């Protein structure tokens, strides 16, 4: 605290250790609400220096369901109106209905999450990634563990449904070397009978494709 | 409601015996007394008729999927979470669209995947294109060199 109009930033306290009472509690790390304590016992300046927060979770860590990212039900000590009674109360976070679209499982999915999760989802690139880079005891949800499983399947199904495109392109490539000439349409049966990729399915499928050449023009 | 015998026999010989040439037992003929149930009774005994799809593969294409480098992991269906309990207590909860809700998902086995925006799909199609590029070395032989350059960096030291 200094009184000049324009106090340009500087390395150290320009005018000695900052004077005032509230500067006395900031010089020791406490917050400026220590100025309103009537007793500042060695436990008090421990209690209010936030060494370890007096703040807990509504349900057990194991039974927790709604995704509370990094929150507790912190109690806020209020001082009442005209006659200053001091009372305290437990303030919760705001849980929104998280109705997201996790494109891993190509469908909306709902998990109720605190506002802070609805931000850290978007900071993580998607809803699913926020489920996936968090880990067990960190993402202490239960719904988050039911939707991580579907996320872990419906990912390892994409990877599986990918290698299809590498076992299919292998066939498609290696069979083209036997669809080389249109000499015999009795032979196009035999090459198809070779890879057991029947004609009646393929013929019209290519037909629908040349029609699709006409569906897309 | 096809209740009175005169009405049930007037429908059952015509639609389930006549049109479909199905024949219902006695104990099912009891509950087979509505347009809703007539439809289902058929739609079970005709669904139990389609020859079970025969997974038959040729040989010439078979040796392709064997020698092909990239193979499927293919065990994930079990990782899926189980919801086993009394069928009523399990289905009372789906009293409404409690289906996609609260970390559940009606997992229908999907055979093809949308490729647009699908992170986990582009997350590997590049990792694949990073595998075809690394694979290019071993084809030409710059891998063996760049690997034989380590041991000659790690020998004289």
């Amino acid at each position: 605290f200094s009184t000049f109009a324009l106090n340009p930033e500087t390395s150290r306290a320009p005018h000695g250790p900052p004077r005032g009472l509230i500067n006395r509690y900031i010089s020791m790390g406490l917050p400026p609400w220590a100025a309103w304590c009537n007793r500042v016992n060695r436990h008090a300046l421990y209690r209010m220096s936030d060494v370890s927060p007096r703040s807990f979770l509504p349900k057990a860590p194991h039974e927790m369901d709604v995704i509370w990212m990094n929150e507790r039900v912190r109690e806020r000590v209020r001082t009442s109106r005209q006659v200053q009674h001091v009372y305290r109360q437990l303030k919760y976070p705001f849980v929104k209905t998280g109705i997201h679209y996790s494109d891993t499982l190509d469908h909306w999915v709902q998990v109720p999450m605190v506002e802070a999760a609805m931000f850290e989802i978007e900071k993580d690139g998607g809803f699913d990634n926020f489920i996936l880079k968090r880990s067990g005891p960190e993402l202490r949800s239960t719904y988050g563990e039911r939707i991580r499983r579907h996320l872990l399947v419906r990912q390892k199904e994409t990877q599986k449904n990918f290698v299809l495109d590498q076992q299919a392109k292998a066939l498609a490539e290696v069979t083209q070397a036997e669809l080389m000439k249109a000499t015999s349409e009795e032979e196009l049966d035999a090459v198809l009978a070779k890879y057991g990729m029947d004609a009646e399915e393929f013929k019209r499928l290519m037909a629908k494709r040349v029609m699709e050449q006409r569906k897309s023009v | 409601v096809f209740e009175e015998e005169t009405l049930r026999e007037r429908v059952l010989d015509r639609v389930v015996e006549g049109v479909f040439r199905l024949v219902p037992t006695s104990t099912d003929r009891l509950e087979l007394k509505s347009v809703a149930n007539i439809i289902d009774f058929v739609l079970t005994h005709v669904t139990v008729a389609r020859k079970p799809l025969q997974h038959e593969i040729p040989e010439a294409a078979r040796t392709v999927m064997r020698s092909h480098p990239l193979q499927p992991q293919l065990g994930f269906v079990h990782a899926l979470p189980t919801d086993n309990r009394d069928a009523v207590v399990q289905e009372w909860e789906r009293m409404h669209h409690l289906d996609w809700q609260f970390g559940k998902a009606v997992y229908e086995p999907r055979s093809a995947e949308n490729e647009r925006g699908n992170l986990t799909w582009l997350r590997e199609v590049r990792h694949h294109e990073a595998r075809e590029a690394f694979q290019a070395d071993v084809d030409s032989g710059e891998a063996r060199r760049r690997h034989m350059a380590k041991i000659k960096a790690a020998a004289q030291v």
Binding site: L164, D165, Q176, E201, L205, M206 | -
Partner: peptide, 7 residues
Amino acid sequence: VRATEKL
């Protein structure tokens, strides 16, 4: 059936 659809 996927190798079918490419062609």
